[PDB]
Structures are given as structure tokens and as C-alpha cells.
Amino acid sequence: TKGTTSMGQRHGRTHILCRRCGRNSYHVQWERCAACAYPRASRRRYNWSVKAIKRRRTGTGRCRYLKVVNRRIANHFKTPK
Amino acid sequence: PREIKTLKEFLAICSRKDARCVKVKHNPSATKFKVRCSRYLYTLVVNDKKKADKIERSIHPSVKKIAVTARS
Amino acid sequence: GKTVLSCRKGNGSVYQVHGHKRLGPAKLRILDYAERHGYMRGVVKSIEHEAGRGAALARVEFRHPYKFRRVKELMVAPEGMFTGQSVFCGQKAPLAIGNVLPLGQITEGCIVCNVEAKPGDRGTLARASGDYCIIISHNHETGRTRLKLPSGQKKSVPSTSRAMIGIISGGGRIEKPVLKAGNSFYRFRGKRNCWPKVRGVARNPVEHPHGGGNHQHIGHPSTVSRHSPPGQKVGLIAARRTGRIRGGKAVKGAW
Amino acid sequence: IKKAMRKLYQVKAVKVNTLIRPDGLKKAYIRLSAAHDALDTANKIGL
Amino acid sequence: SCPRVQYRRRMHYATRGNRMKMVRTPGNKLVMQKRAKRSQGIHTPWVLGHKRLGG
Amino acid sequence: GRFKPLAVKKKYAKKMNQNKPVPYWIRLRTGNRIKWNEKRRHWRRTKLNY
RNA sequence: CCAACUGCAGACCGUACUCAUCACCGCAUCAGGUCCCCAAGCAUAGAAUGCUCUGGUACAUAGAGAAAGGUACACUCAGGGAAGUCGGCAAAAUAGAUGCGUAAGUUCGCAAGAAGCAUUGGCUCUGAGGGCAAAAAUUGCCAACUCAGAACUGCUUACGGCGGGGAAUCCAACUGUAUAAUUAAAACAUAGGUUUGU
RNA sequence: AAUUACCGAAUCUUUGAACGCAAACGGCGCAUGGGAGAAGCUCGUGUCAUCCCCGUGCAUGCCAUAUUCUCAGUGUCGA
RNA sequence: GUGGUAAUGCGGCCAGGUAACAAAUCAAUCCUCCCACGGUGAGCUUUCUUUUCACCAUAAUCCACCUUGGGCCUUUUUACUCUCGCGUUGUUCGGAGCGGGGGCUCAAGAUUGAAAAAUGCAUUGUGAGUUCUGCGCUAAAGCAAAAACCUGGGGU
RNA sequence: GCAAAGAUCUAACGGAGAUAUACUCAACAUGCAACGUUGGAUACUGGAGCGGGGAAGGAUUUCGUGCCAACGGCACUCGUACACGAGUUGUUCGGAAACUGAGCACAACGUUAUAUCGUUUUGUUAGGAAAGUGAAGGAACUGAAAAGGGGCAACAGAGAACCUGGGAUUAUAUUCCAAAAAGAAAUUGCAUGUGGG
RNA sequence: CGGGGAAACCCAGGUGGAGGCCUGUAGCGAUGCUGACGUGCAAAUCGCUCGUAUGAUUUGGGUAUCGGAGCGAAAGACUCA
Ligand SMILES: [K+]
Ligand SMILES: [K+]
Ligand SMILES: [K+]
Ligand SMILES: [K+]
Ligand SMILES: [Mg+2]
Ligand SMILES: [Mg+2]
Ligand SMILES: [Mg+2]
Ligand SMILES: [Mg+2]
Ligand SMILES: [Mg+2]
Ligand SMILES: [Mg+2]
Ligand SMILES: [Mg+2]
Ligand SMILES: [Mg+2]
Ligand SMILES: [Mg+2]
Ligand SMILES: [Mg+2]
Ligand SMILES: [Mg+2]
Ligand SMILES: [Mg+2]
Ligand SMILES: [Mg+2]
Ligand SMILES: [Mg+2]
Ligand SMILES: [Mg+2]
Ligand SMILES: [Mg+2]
Ligand SMILES: [Mg+2]
Ligand SMILES: [Mg+2]
Ligand SMILES: [Mg+2]
Ligand SMILES: [Mg+2]
Ligand SMILES: [Mg+2]
Ligand SMILES: [Mg+2]
Ligand SMILES: [Mg+2]
Ligand SMILES: [Mg+2]
Ligand SMILES: [Mg+2]
Ligand SMILES: [Mg+2]
Ligand SMILES: [Mg+2]
Ligand SMILES: [Mg+2]
Ligand SMILES: [Mg+2]
Ligand SMILES: [Mg+2]
Ligand SMILES: [Mg+2]
Ligand SMILES: [Mg+2]
Ligand SMILES: [Mg+2]
Ligand SMILES: [Mg+2]
Ligand SMILES: [Mg+2]
Ligand SMILES: [Mg+2]
Ligand SMILES: [Mg+2]
Ligand SMILES: [Mg+2]
Ligand SMILES: [Mg+2]
Ligand SMILES: [Mg+2]
Ligand SMILES: [Mg+2]
Ligand SMILES: [Mg+2]
Ligand SMILES: [Mg+2]
Ligand SMILES: [Mg+2]
Ligand SMILES: [Mg+2]
Ligand SMILES: [Mg+2]
Ligand SMILES: [Mg+2]
Ligand SMILES: [Mg+2]
Ligand SMILES: [Mg+2]
Ligand SMILES: [Mg+2]
Ligand SMILES: [Mg+2]
Ligand code: NA
Ligand code: NA
Ligand code: NA
Ligand code: NA
Ligand SMILES: [Zn+2]
């Protein structure tokens, strides 16, 4: 019967970890990610969910290089003699 | 493991450079000489005690000699 | 409403051929220079059964005309073919069961099978078990030949087209009653996903034009126009007549 | 690992067994040849 | 009482390629050992009869 | 079971190392605000599923 | 170049534990669900069912203790025997094996375990059913069970397990499928028959 | 200075448009330059086969170019 | 390269083979259980019990070389002349070569030894079960493929 | 209300968890109830097992010492709880290196305002020039042959060179054991003799 | 293989092991009690009884087909309560 008994019939898994975005959203059979559309070159982005866009945009991570290049621009690419 | 049925063939094996040692086993009915080469363990079986003592001697001292006993 | 089953089958999906056990397509030799000018001799090596087909197949071995190797062909076997038999194919082949000859070289009134509709097509007519075609006449001025097909129709083909002498093996298959649902199950297992069949009047109105009602009945005539759109063209499509046939049965098909 | 052991401690290793621990680190059991004594080498290291 | 055995390699299914036999060891224990597959041997061509060749 | 990719094994290893209480000398710092780890995980409560 | 011999070297990842009346899914240490391998003794046709050596376990909140009324994988009841009730619902009843015997109807296959009658314990005996060696149609040695017959002597009819039967009407030919969680049917499917297009 | 503030010189693991080939694999190549080498060879040295380690280049498309690189065409000529 | 009348024994390219495949019946291997005959230890013992229980093991890898089940060779072949013969529990086989004599070969076992007692614990005979294996290989259903490997035909 | 799955009893150790008293008083009538381990006794599971091993899933729940605030719907001196410290060893076991199947879709081409669309095993891509080295020839070069681009998809199909003993752990073992390797083997790569050619 | 017959054939005894055959475990289901429970052991479970059990049979892993759509031995059934 549907309900409690059928919950014990669920084996395996549909999704695993994604190499590109790290979420548990990589469809094993279709070999594509439901969150970032990997391995497509571009990523998922939809205007009907601005809240989801703000969770993934630039500045939500580390910005290892952007911080450095922002400093060089502000100092007009200073160099010694 | 391989068996040799000639004294002449046994001396050739003992004279090989790969023979690490020889083990002497004393059974109630017979005596066994076991030579440990690199790949195989050759065994010679004799039935006369007098011949065993003579064969026990006349062995090149370079080849080590071990007397097989139960170890505790 | 929702899509009808006949239209759904056109997408493919789970309604395609079960072909894993099949040996491959069955065809004649390629119409090459040797076949056009002289003849080629091959040897029958084996006779085998293929899932989903009622006729037996034959493997025939020939020599390659330009290189040092052997060529194997898979053909539909006429009745009487045996292992070790010699098969001659070409313009100069003699008239015997199993040989392949141009239609212009075959005497009028002969029985043939594996007939090419167009020259070089490698056989498209009279291939089911027990079937054959009959040669009616030749026209040397036009270079054409007239044939009577298994359906009863008559067709004109170029005299260059090839044919095999004899009738297709395995005849008499449909004379034995099936008697069991499981036998039909096994019969269609080798062919495709098309059995069992559910009647249209047993469905609901959302799925079929015949569905619904407090009685099982069709509320409108079941003869439908040739111009009906898909999803509406069910029943007896563009029927010229209905009911039990009295007297002789006419030949089916178009003019 | 065999080469590094020779270059760092001047000993000969006859067998190396490795495993990756459940905490992510890699551990190696290194058996020395009979010519050397593991206890003597351990004292030089400082165990 | 009567002993029972377990698979000693990493495959635990009873297929034609995973047949086992029961062996008693010099230590007086009952273990399972895998028995190898066998070949049908050299035959004549299939289209000529497919019979084993002598010698 | 026995099987797992090495990448999966390393992710589980990191989660094992993070499952620890706060050291006691942390509470004695000037302006401290931390009392418990507040991210402790137990295998029966919440699943990692990787 | 080929044969033994010999010398040296054999890289990477997995390896703890669990697999369930507590380690997985069901909000939980939930009487639900979840694939594979090894499987002892006696009774017996037996992977039925009952008890037992090895291995495992005494964990499931407990103590005292004849109210009424309940639940039960618990029973029994004089005389009558469906008079109860919409309705024989529920319960009762038949029962293993062996011999004899068995109607209408029928697509000749069945109906059929039709219906029905009889026997069955214990003990002490007798007969039949074989292998191997030397009118051998004879001599010796030996194993494992089954069936049949007889005398004597008992019953309080006494574990478990195990069909009630018959005479007719309506529907569907039959095996099968099917509304997960109120409907399993006369519904669907089926072999057989007919028609249409090409 | 284990102080702070700022910035010009540096370092910068595995991936990712990810681009040598793949991928629930810390996997497998070609070319080139190095490293280490308890075998063997040789007079503790040198040299080193198999195995092992490291750096660099190697996706597709398009533009320009070749001290004027190598080619194909029953395309058009010519000798 | 070379023996045997023979089945067969021993020192670029092309064509085949292994991998490679449903049932049932009968006989089964390792192994399990039971019985018999002996050794060792323990239990019961008012009475009885030549008694009850436990144990008595041999891995892989190699030498040498009787059984029974297929395939084949040679020789006798007036073998089926007038009810022909051999054979299975069983649905059949023979001048396209049965049966008998003598052989070649394959598969599964048995036996002798090396390992191996130096180990382990503190013995070798019959019945019942058991799918390895052998008995060559319903259907209008007739039971995957490839890598890798093996042999040959030519040529050198 | 904490009632399916039959069940516990006894003595001795351990523990704060006792034999815990104001007068009177010999003891009962004034410290009850409950716990872990060991030895006995009595039962249950009954080989389709509350036996011994694996896959999916879980990810330290494994082991030792300590501890009893919260949690184990009663209890605890106990714990899959909490704290500290530890544990997973391979030429041969499973995977990959290195097969193909139902199938997938990179390149190529086409289509679409838009590639984030379609084709892509019936021997097989693409209007389609997709082969990059055998021998040679005098030591690196140079180029004949052969139609049909590059991959992935099976931890139960194909494939696969190792077995026993151990007094060898608190926890791992066909993975550990060291000169009498307890030992006995098989197999791959490259080199050195010996023999033959 | 025994008997009968002029012939066509007939009668009787064995062997063998067929079937979408029958009784019946495991398995796969779900007829009745309109039983228990119905703030449950459980957002569908428990007990006895019952259908089938060599086939159109049951089951693991992989793979293919979906929202104006998929799939359906057809109940408007099912497509993560
Ligand atoms: K169907
Ligand atoms: K209607
Ligand atoms: K209706
Ligand atoms: K030209
Ligand atoms: Mg197709
Ligand atoms: Mg309806
Ligand atoms: Mg409509
Ligand atoms: Mg009707
Ligand atoms: Mg209409
Ligand atoms: Mg390892
Ligand atoms: Mg997991
Ligand atoms: Mg383990
Ligand atoms: Mg289990
Ligand atoms: Mg419980
Ligand atoms: Mg449970
Ligand atoms: Mg009995
Ligand atoms: Mg049972
Ligand atoms: Mg039983
Ligand atoms: Mg309870
Ligand atoms: Mg209890
Ligand atoms: Mg009461
Ligand atoms: Mg009464
Ligand atoms: Mg009465
Ligand atoms: Mg009344
Ligand atoms: Mg009733
Ligand atoms: Mg009658
Ligand atoms: Mg009766
Ligand atoms: Mg009747
Ligand atoms: Mg019906
Ligand atoms: Mg049935
Ligand atoms: Mg039915
Ligand atoms: Mg319902
Ligand atoms: Mg109907
Ligand atoms: Mg009819
Ligand atoms: Mg890359
Ligand atoms: Mg004859
Ligand atoms: Mg109360
Ligand atoms: Mg209570
Ligand atoms: Mg209650
Ligand atoms: Mg209870
Ligand atoms: Mg007390
Ligand atoms: Mg006790
Ligand atoms: Mg069990
Ligand atoms: Mg509590
Ligand atoms: Mg903890
Ligand atoms: Mg820790
Ligand atoms: Mg196609
Ligand atoms: Mg494919
Ligand atoms: Mg391709
Ligand atoms: Mg496999
Ligand atoms: Mg392996
Ligand atoms: Mg363990
Ligand atoms: Mg039945
Ligand atoms: Mg009710
Ligand atoms: Mg309706
Ligand atoms: Na095919
Ligand atoms: Na029909
Ligand atoms: Na049993
Ligand atoms: Na039967
Ligand atoms: Zn992603």
C-alpha cells in the first residue's frame, strides 16, 4: 500500500555530488546537474527566482583574484623605478 | 618440490651456487636430504642407514647443514 | 482529450522492433559486373531460423571478385534448398530452383520469388513464407515484364530486374490454430509490443472517439473520411463497402 | 618511499606496506633489512 | 555439530563462473575453494559437424 | 559497504575531524562569545548522504 | 635466435563495523518494507508441523491479585436440532493410508477423492523379493529394506497434520488481469469469427 | 618587533569557460628536457636495462604568415 | 625435423577453433549424515548397562602410470537367412559397415611418490543425501556479442 | 494508559545506593524498592534461527580506559550515550589499467530569431581529402600497405598468476610471520651464464 | 510384449513422463469474519480463514518513454503519502 509500507521500497539514489558546484544534484542516469547544468559550458540562471541568483553570484565566495586586481586598478598600476 | 633418484644428480644440485642449505630429516624407516635452491626444494630419499651416514659426510662445507627437529 | 494510442505509437519509444536476436537484413547479392555479364557460383553453408520471421534463411558463400577473401551472404531460402547446394547468380545462370536470373531471361509462365521492384534493389517482392509471383508476359520493344503479385494485382517492371526461381519456404504456417493466449504471447515476443488489444468501446471518452456511454456502443458511423486528421481517423478508413462479402471477393488496393 | 628512506636515514627497506587512515592521512609500515637494526635506527631518530 | 561455510573471495553469488567446492584442511577446518571453468576443447568447423578432434 | 571513491572517503574524513568540542581555553579570551560547538553531528540524528 | 637455470624489480585505489523485532527507508531503538551464499538429529511423503546437540538468548516497565463489562492465534454443555437471522453469518462437521465400489451428463479428455462399505495397536513367528566366489538345476560368504500371511494379547477409539456431501436455476467458455487506502465481479484480456486501408 | 597601516617585489595545492583522453577512477597517453637508481658493466667510484618521479607542449574554430614549406584537381593554359 | 599399414606418436595475407550459452531422466564428485570394527578421553553407576557422549585431520603445486564413458583405425565381414543381431530405466542402431579379436585417442576418476611431520588434535570399510561432472549437443518460443588466446594454408 | 513475540530463580563478589531508629527494647510489628559480574538451576530460538558472511544504504556506530548532567517513554553501578586515547598492511582478493550489450551523445553536418534542437550499430559519422609508420635506403630521417572519426556504458555477463599452519591483535588478515622467512608455489618485465643452432 | 482375425483391424499387460492439469511449502496476492485496532505497533497494520503456486510465473542491477504529457489485459488506474 502507498504510504508507510512503500517507504521501504525506495532503494538506490537519483542524484550524487556534482564536480562543478558541489551540491547533491548530479543526475546519475542522465549525467547532468540539476543546479548548474554541468557539463554544459554555461550555468543555470533564471529571472523567475532572483533569490536563487543572489545565492550564487559573484561575492558569495572568496574572490581570490578579484581583490588583487581591484587594488591594482585603484592605484593606477603602480610600479617601482 | 622435486625428487631426485640418483646420488650423482644429488651432488650436482648440492654443488650449485644457488643451494642455500641442506636439511637432514631422520624418519624411522628412511632418511631424507632436502636441498633449498632458489625456485625448488629437491629431496633425495635413501633407505640404508650406513649409506646415509656416508652421504651425510662428503658434503661441501660451503653449503650449510641443518638438522630438522621439532621446535618449541 | 488525450492522445490516442495509434498516434502515440508514432513517437517510437517502447513500440519499436525487438531486434536483438535477429541475424541482420536478408538480401540478394550486389548487382556487379560479374552478375551483369557472366555468372557467379556460390555454396550453401547453413540454413537457420530467425526470431520474428516465418521463413528460413540461408547463408551462401562466394569468392570476392577483386580480392583474395570469401564473402558471406544471408538470403531468404526457397523451399527445397539444402546444405552443400550450388547456387548460380548472373546473366548466364541456368534455369533451376535457387538460381538468380534477370527477368528477361526467364520463360513466361514461371514461378519466382525475391523479385526486385527496381534494378539493384536486392529483392523487395514476394518474401513472406509460402508466397511467390507469376510471370505473365514480356515486351521486348519497351524492355519490360509483367508480373502477377501475391495480392492478385499486376505490375510492370524493367526486364533488368532480378528474381530467384521457386517459392518461399515455410508455407502452411497459418493453417494451425493457436488455441492459447500464451502462444500469442510468445509469437509477438519476437516481433514487437502490440499485444494484447483493447477494444475502443471499452475505453473512456478522453482517450478514444468510441469511448463512453451507459452502454458499450459507437454512437456514429464507424466509416471515416480519407481527409480526417490524426486522432479522428479510427475505425474503417475510407471504406468503399462494408458487411459480409457475397459472391467473389474483389482484389484489394488502389487502382 | 623506499628511495627517501635510503636518502634520509641510510638504511635499506625490503618491504613497504601503506594504508590511508580514516582521518585522511597516509601511514607506512617500513620493514628494514636484516643488516640494520630498527631499534638502533629508532634511537638515532629520537624515539 | 555440523559446520557451515562462507565465501572467502569478494563475490557472493552462485553463477556458473563462481562454483565452489568443500575442502577439509590439515587444521581440521572446512573451507570453500573456487573450481576453475573448463573448455569444450578443439572442434571441427561448425558447418561440417562440429566434432571433437582426436589427439 | 566496502566500496567508496577516494574523493568520497576524504569528505567523510574531514567531517570526522570537525566533530569535536570547543577547547576550554577559548572561553577565557577577552570578548569571547562561544560556549559550545553548535555544529556537532551524530550519526543517528542527521545524515550526510555522501 | 631458441630452451631451461640464475640475478633484480613487481606501481594505483578499497579493506574498521553494520546489514536489521536497535546501525537502512518509514519524523523514533516503530508488530510495516528491504536482494544473495552455508542449513544438523528423531517422528513423517516432507524445507508441512512438533521436540532436540552446536551457535545464540532470558531484551521487550514490573509487583499483588477469583468485581462487573471486555479481547483471545481458549474450552465444555442435559433435551430439541436453523424453530435464530435479510441471509446457516460464526461455530460445529469431514479428514491419513489400503481394499472393494461408484449415477445422470459429455466436446470421449472427464464428471471422480462422485456417492458409499470395510481394515488399521502391541507381541512372537512364517513366506517372497539379491550380490560375490569356486541337473554349478551344486556348494560356501555377505548387505539393505519393503510387502504379504498366521497365532496370542489389548483399547478409556486417545499428540501433531489433514476434503463435509448431494439435487437444480442465472452469468462468463476455460488459465489469466484489475479500482496501492470501502467495489475481484457478470467488468478487461483470450483463442476463434468478420470487415477496412495498402 | 609574532606591533599596526599602506603598497610597487614574490609565493599561490585539486578543480572549474577547462582546452592531450576520460571520470561515483586523486586513472591512462604521445613528444621533449631532467632526477633517482642496492641489478648487470667497469676501475668505495663512475655508467646504467626494466620499474619509478618531476617540468613543458599536445582541444575546436577563425585571422595573419612560411626569405617564400609540402601537396591535389578528365579547372584554365603552356611547352 | 622425424616414427607407425592406420587411428596418430616423439623432438604482409587468408581460413577455422576456444571464449560460447535451453530442459527432463539415470548415474554422480568434493562434502554431509548413518552403521560396523578398533584406539584415546569424559559421563552414569541404590540396581542395570562388554554401556552413553566426544575425537581419530592432510592445502595449493608437481612425478610416474587400473577402472568406465565417448570418438576412431585395422582384420574377419554370407552381418539380416525368412522369427537377423547388439544395446538403454527410457522414446534405436547397422553394407553410408552390426557383432567378435587386436589397437589409437579424449574426458572423469583410481593408485605410487615429493610436499608432509618438522604440521594439527590430545581409522578404514558399507548404506542415504548431494548438480561438480557424464550420459554430445512447450515451440507460429529454437536460446547474446567482443577483447584475448590456439591451430592451420601459403610464403620466407 | 506504558497488556503481540511464553520467564525467570538462587548464592557470592562489586557499589554511596545499608542491617541507615529520639526514648523503650531481643529479634518481626520503624530504610522499602532496584542494579552489574561470576558459579549453579530452569527455559526459549529450533538450520526458511534474537546462527556465520556480503550487495544497496549508513559512515566511526568498531576497540580499550573512565564517567553517569542530559538521552536509552520503568530502571541501571550498564550502553550503538558522553570524554580521552587507538585501530583498516596485498605482485596473485574486488576495481582500474584492458571486452562487448540494452543504450548515451563529443566531433561533423543540418535546422532554429535563439543550440540549451536533430542525426549518430540494419557494418557503423560527415558533399566525405579524418590512415603519420613495417620495412627500408645509405643514424637519425624519408615513405608502402591497408574503406567506414574519437569515446563512455556490467564490483552478479566475458576476463582474472596463492595455498595451508601460527602461542599472530584490545581492535586487521588467503593482506601480518625473516634465514631453518612456519613454509611450499605460480606468474610479468628486463639482464647474465650454460647448452643447442 | 500376450491373445484374436482371410484381410482391414480389435482386445489385454507393461514401459515412459506430457499438461497456461490437481492437493500442497517458500514465494506472489487479498475472499470472509462486515473479527482486533480505530487520539493504533501502523497517515492502511494485526489474527484466523482464503486465491495461485512450470508459468500470459516471481525477483536484483542496468537502460528507454512524462505534464495542454507519458504509460495502461481499460479501474479515469498509476506517474516519490
Ligand atoms: K503489451
Ligand atoms: K460511446
Ligand atoms: K462502462
Ligand atoms: K591538372
Ligand atoms: Mg531498431
Ligand atoms: Mg469503464
Ligand atoms: Mg473526443
Ligand atoms: Mg456488448
Ligand atoms: Mg465522431
Ligand atoms: Mg592496500
Ligand atoms: Mg553511500
Ligand atoms: Mg571485515
Ligand atoms: Mg545477513
Ligand atoms: Mg525491541
Ligand atoms: Mg522494525
Ligand atoms: Mg519412519
Ligand atoms: Mg518450517
Ligand atoms: Mg521440518
Ligand atoms: Mg511494550
Ligand atoms: Mg523479560
Ligand atoms: Mg474478567
Ligand atoms: Mg446441547
Ligand atoms: Mg438430526
Ligand atoms: Mg423469526
Ligand atoms: Mg462459514
Ligand atoms: Mg455412466
Ligand atoms: Mg473416498
Ligand atoms: Mg456432481
Ligand atoms: Mg471467467
Ligand atoms: Mg492456475
Ligand atoms: Mg481465476
Ligand atoms: Mg480498493
Ligand atoms: Mg468480455
Ligand atoms: Mg463463437
Ligand atoms: Mg581535461
Ligand atoms: Mg545381420
Ligand atoms: Mg492508571
Ligand atoms: Mg500493564
Ligand atoms: Mg493497550
Ligand atoms: Mg508479553
Ligand atoms: Mg533492602
Ligand atoms: Mg545469575
Ligand atoms: Mg539467520
Ligand atoms: Mg528512563
Ligand atoms: Mg560519541
Ligand atoms: Mg576519537
Ligand atoms: Mg538509426
Ligand atoms: Mg551498442
Ligand atoms: Mg562510432
Ligand atoms: Mg564477473
Ligand atoms: Mg584480481
Ligand atoms: Mg572483526
Ligand atoms: Mg492448484
Ligand atoms: Mg471490521
Ligand atoms: Mg466511470
Ligand atoms: Na542482432
Ligand atoms: Na480477435
Ligand atoms: Na534442518
Ligand atoms: Na507430472
Ligand atoms: Zn552542479
mmCIF file of C-alpha atoms (C1' of nucleotides) in Angstrom, chain K residues 13-51:
data_model
loop_
_atom_site.group_PDB
_atom_site.id
_atom_site.type_symbol
_atom_site.label_atom_id
_atom_site.label_comp_id
_atom_site.label_asym_id
_atom_site.label_seq_id
_atom_site.Cartn_x
_atom_site.Cartn_y
_atom_site.Cartn_z
ATOM 1 C "C1'" G K 13 -0.473 -56.230 -19.650
ATOM 2 C "C1'" G K 14 3.866 -53.238 -19.032
ATOM 3 C "C1'" U K 15 7.295 -49.024 -20.016
ATOM 4 C "C1'" G K 16 7.507 -43.601 -20.382
ATOM 5 C "C1'" G K 17 6.676 -38.946 -18.053
ATOM 6 C "C1'" A K 18 3.044 -34.595 -21.306
ATOM 7 C "C1'" G K 19 -0.199 -30.608 -19.358
ATOM 8 C "C1'" G K 20 -1.222 -21.808 -19.477
ATOM 9 C "C1'" C K 21 -3.541 -30.237 -15.227
ATOM 10 C "C1'" C K 22 -4.903 -31.196 -9.490
ATOM 11 C "C1'" U K 23 -3.562 -31.387 -3.497
ATOM 12 C "C1'" G K 24 0.223 -28.643 -1.082
ATOM 13 C "C1'" U K 25 5.563 -25.331 1.437
ATOM 14 C "C1'" A K 26 8.655 -20.907 0.171
ATOM 15 C "C1'" G K 27 7.078 -17.001 -2.990
ATOM 16 C "C1'" C K 28 3.325 -13.730 -5.236
ATOM 17 C "C1'" G K 29 -1.824 -11.954 -3.598
ATOM 18 C "C1'" A K 30 -6.049 -10.338 -0.649
ATOM 19 C "C1'" U K 31 -12.295 -13.646 -0.138
ATOM 20 C "C1'" G K 32 -14.955 -13.560 4.751
ATOM 21 C "C1'" C K 33 -15.235 -12.575 9.810
ATOM 22 C "C1'" U K 34 -18.578 -6.511 7.552
ATOM 23 C "C1'" G K 35 -13.027 -10.045 13.828
ATOM 24 C "C1'" A K 36 -8.880 -6.856 16.656
ATOM 25 C "C1'" C K 37 -7.274 -1.667 16.436
ATOM 26 C "C1'" G K 38 -9.751 2.717 15.083
ATOM 27 C "C1'" U K 39 -6.000 10.096 19.813
ATOM 28 C "C1'" G K 40 -3.011 2.383 16.706
ATOM 29 C "C1'" C K 41 2.572 -1.215 16.762
ATOM 30 C "C1'" A K 42 0.812 1.325 11.707
ATOM 31 C "C1'" A K 43 -1.392 8.848 7.909
ATOM 32 C "C1'" A K 44 -3.967 1.022 5.775
ATOM 33 C "C1'" U K 45 -1.263 -2.621 10.450
ATOM 34 C "C1'" C K 46 -2.534 -7.499 13.125
ATOM 35 C "C1'" G K 47 -5.162 -12.763 13.647
ATOM 36 C "C1'" C K 48 -7.596 -16.861 11.653
ATOM 37 C "C1'" U K 49 -9.772 -18.156 7.066
ATOM 38 C "C1'" C K 50 -8.942 -17.789 1.798
ATOM 39 C "C1'" G K 51 -6.693 -17.456 -4.357
#
